[PDB]
Amino acid sequence: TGHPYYLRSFLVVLKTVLENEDDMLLFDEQEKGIVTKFYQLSATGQKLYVRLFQRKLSWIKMTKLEYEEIALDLTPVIEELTNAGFLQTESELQELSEVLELLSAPELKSLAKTFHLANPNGQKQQLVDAFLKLAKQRSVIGAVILKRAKALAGQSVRICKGPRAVFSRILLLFSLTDSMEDEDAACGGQGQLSTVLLVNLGRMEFPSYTINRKTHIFQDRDDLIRYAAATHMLSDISSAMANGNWEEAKELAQCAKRDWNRLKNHPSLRCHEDLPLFLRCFTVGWIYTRILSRFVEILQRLHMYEEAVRELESLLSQRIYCPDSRGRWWDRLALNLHQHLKRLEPTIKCITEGLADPEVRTGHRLSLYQRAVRLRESPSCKKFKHLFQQLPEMAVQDVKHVTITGRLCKSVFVMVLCSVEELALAHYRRSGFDQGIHGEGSTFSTLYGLLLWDIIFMDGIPDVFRNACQAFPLDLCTDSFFTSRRPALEARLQLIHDAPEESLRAWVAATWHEQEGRVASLVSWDRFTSLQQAQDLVSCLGGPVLSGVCRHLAADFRHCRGGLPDLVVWNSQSRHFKLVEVKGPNDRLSHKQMIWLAELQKLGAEVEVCHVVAV
DNA sequence: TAGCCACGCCT
DNA sequence: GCTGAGGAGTCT
DNA sequence: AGACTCCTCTTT
DNA sequence: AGGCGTG
Ligand SMILES: [Ba+2]
């Protein structure tokens, strides 16, 4: 462990995936050997590879490579990696567009000149398109350009794409069990370790649980490769959207929409369809559906609202993939029909079916009910009685609103510089709550985590723990997390409800002491300032409330994890607390948020929206 | 749709 | 658009 | 000269 | 004011 941080982290990944019997079925021998080859390198040889694996994939000037901590002179090390088959040298640098790319605009000028036919000025981009048109006609002069371009660029290494590929697939796999260590790190461009992972994994200590895998996710190394392909596609589409190239993204999508209807009969699907949901998210079909969702987003941006409706109706026609997404869809469907396609007939059928789908929850549920009333009680609609149709009167109860002012300067205010939220925490200090946290959902989530820790990492649920560095059972964000643990859950949620404020102070003390540091997705250790703070807070919150919140989180974290209030403020001595949703000059309450506030009131908790106006 | 935010537009 | 901080190279 | 784009390194 | 999009 004179291994620097980035190497320790890389090794954990390799180990974690290599000890999966199931995972190792999806690598041929050729592939498997490369890993051995890695392990065979010297410590130096390894350090340097990780560095370069992490760097962008392409050619690097030998003079641009400095790691003192690896060695003062890296030529030996490079030679090892070359011989090993991991790194290639300027010697294999053959493509012109590659040689040019590697050179600086300065150098590009020096070659634009010492070639008489070249206009020595313009951008770097131009001089390239130039030198490439020239070598394409008079080929024999092109080989002389390349000859110098090379000699001019210098000594240069590149990571070999082939072995690289194996490590990315390993990284990909590591990342399913770490939720998705990132779609951006693993799934796109190509796999590197996320920043946080690369830094911390080597030090991280995980909650103890029992690995118990009883089902395969992938049929064979082929299924993996098809999945990896869909993954990369979704990544490149998301990437396009991000860079605003909505035209490219529409193609890319349609492209993928073919391929998916191409796979729609293949043997493998039968088995995937059959997986429990918490695993079904790791299949081609799930990724293709996810892609089709982005596609309706794209149809929407390009304002093609008829198509988007078709696509939404397609997605909703099946319950196989992404059922957690139907709420987003039904809502999105209805919004399109009502707003954009003014078809008031379907808007109702839509809203009706949607609200009859036990799949839709919280925010979207509310948002459909709200459109219903706005619609039924509208004259532009009155010539009907098809929405009086027994709509359960989910009239989200009304909440105390409050307003304060702050001197404006994400929006920054002054009081020293601070946030909308910090400004309010102040108003509340002078309102006689000496104590507060700005924690949004993590305050509550880590309390749920502290109180149910042992039930979460409980033994006896097949398939939820598949390997070594999990921070949660894979079914955590499913309807099955609760069903698979009903009896234990009902029991614990009851105890908590009746617990007096010392049993709580004690249960928390317990987990805290036994688990402090351990990486669990629900628990932020620095979220409270000390164990003592946590105990204060639970004391104020009290069982019935602590129970109610925990019940929602475990029952349906997927759809309840967001829209809890920004602030918790309590009075130390008086034990009175308030749950505050800060609303700066430019944001209102989302449906998710008005559900939470309602539900927190029912639990009998002081809830308040605190509007901030600027000066 | 990951969720957030600031802005801007329409009604 | 954003989800971090600094430096080197490119652009106009 | 200054603005912006790209890339790397983070830690223990 | 609030519903909706855009980046
Ligand atoms: Ba807020």
Side-chain angles (χ1 to χ4, degrees), chain A residues 421 440 566 581-583 587 593:
Chain A
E421 280 90 13
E440 334 221 303
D566 313 277
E581 175 56 32
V582 187
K583 279 307 154 220
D587 94 283
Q593 279 179 328

Side-chain angles (χ1 to χ4, degrees), chain A residues 243-258:
Chain A
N243 311 298
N245 317 308
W246 300 93
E247 280 308 350
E248 189 187 9
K250 179 177 61 62
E251 305 298 338
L252 274 185
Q254 263 146 345
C255 245
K257 197 205 162 149
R258 298 195 317 259

